[PDB]
């Protein structure tokens, strides 16, 4: 629906273990995180519409559409992301604590 279990654009639960990609030699904490990703089809069910019916932005494009955006396609992408704290070694081996934006995909929607 919006959360997945093979279907419409939805949010797939996914855990990235830094050990699985080699980054545990520079990241101290966390040892991984629920990054998630988006996947699925972007259908056209709602007449008078491209993608999100609520977005002003794509309603303006959608309107300017129906009279230089013919070539446009809709993917399943993140609509909401959330930051995460990380404690890691920078490239001079100083220990850094930072809040990294856009780490965790919280919601998916068709563009």
């Amino acid at each position: 629906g919006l959360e997945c279990d093979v279907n419409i654009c939805c949010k797939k639960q996914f855990f990235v273990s830094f050990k699985d990609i080699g980054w545990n030699d520079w990241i101290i904490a966390p040892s991984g995180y629920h990054a998630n990703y988006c996947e699925g089809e972007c259908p056209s069910h709602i007449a008078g519409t491209s993608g999100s019916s609520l977005s002003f932005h794509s309603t303006v494009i959608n309107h300017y559409r129906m009279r230089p955006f013919a070539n446009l396609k809709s993917c399943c992408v993140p609509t909401k992301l959330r930051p995460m704290s990380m404690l890691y070694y920078d490239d001079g081996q100083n220990i850094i604590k930072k809040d990294i934006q856009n780490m965790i995909v919280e919601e998916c929607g068709c563009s």
């Binding site: 101290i28 904490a29 966390p30 040892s31 995180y33 629920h34 959330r82 930051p83 995460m84 704290s85 404690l87 100083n94 220990i95 604590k97 809040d99």
Partner: protein, 91 residues
Amino acid sequence: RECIYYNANWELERTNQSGLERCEGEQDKRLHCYASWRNSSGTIELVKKGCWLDDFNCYDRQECVATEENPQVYFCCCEGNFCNERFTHLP
């Protein structure tokens, strides 16, 4: 949320070494404190303490307990005010 703040690398990072940190967060999410430290044969050396955005690792923890047994740098996090003022190792 408020947390104990400590920065062993204060000089280079140009912060204060110690104090508090008032945590800020978006709307629907939890706040946590963390601690981090070295333990070099029986002697604790503090690395950093402060606030910690929502992570599942910290959830319903009143206590700051080390996540790992023998790493070079230990990490804990906890939920609630000043829960990172003291901490502990694993068994």
